[PDB]
Amino acid sequence: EKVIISNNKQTYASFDPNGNISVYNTQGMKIDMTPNSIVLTDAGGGKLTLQGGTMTYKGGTVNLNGLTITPDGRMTDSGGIGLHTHTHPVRGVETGGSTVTSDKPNG
């Protein structure tokens, strides 16, 4: 039991009597609202969810102005600097054979 508006059985909007609203097409793209969430569904394999005071994307590449986050959750900025791969020059040292570990970043 809901109200449904549809054009040619291809494009739809539905409003139910309990807090659910859905806009969708037969291809499976959807924009949903429920009592506690907003969800954008991409039929090609992505979903953006706002629920519980959190925001989640799960899918393929996220691109924010050229900064990228892979499907595996690794980040590289638009210049190619990877959070998980980057290195730093360290100047002003004596060379030798030992290894030390840096501290966390300044700031």
Footprint of Na ion on 42-101 (CB under 5 A): 68, 72, 76, 80-82, 85-86
Q: How many CA atoms lie within 13 A of 44 on its CB side?
A: 2
Q: Closest distance between a second copy and the C-beta of residue 28, in Å?
A: 9
Q: Closest distance between a second copy and the C-beta of residue 24, in Å?
A: 8
Helix H, strand E, coil C: the string for 15-37 is ECCCCCEEEEECCCCEEEECCCE
Q: Are 54 and 39 spatial neighbours (Cβ–Cβ below 8 Å)?
A: no
Is 4 a residue that touches a second copy (CB under 8 A)? Answer: no
Q: Closest distance between a second copy and the C-beta of residue 53, in Å?
A: 3
Is 37 a residue that touches a second copy (CB under 8 A)? Answer: yes
- Distance, in Å, from the CA atom of 72 to the CA atom of 18, rounded to the nearest integer, reads 36
Residue type at 55 in one-letter notation: M
Which residues, listed in sequence order, are joined to residue 3 by a DSSP beta bridge? Answer: 15
Is 2 a residue that touches Na ion (CB under 5 A)? Answer: no
Q: Choose among Na ion, a second copy, none what residue 77 binds, the Cβ cut-off being 5 to 8 Å by kind.
A: a second copy
* Binding residues vs Na ion (CB under 5 A): 68, 72, 76, 80-82, 85-86, 107
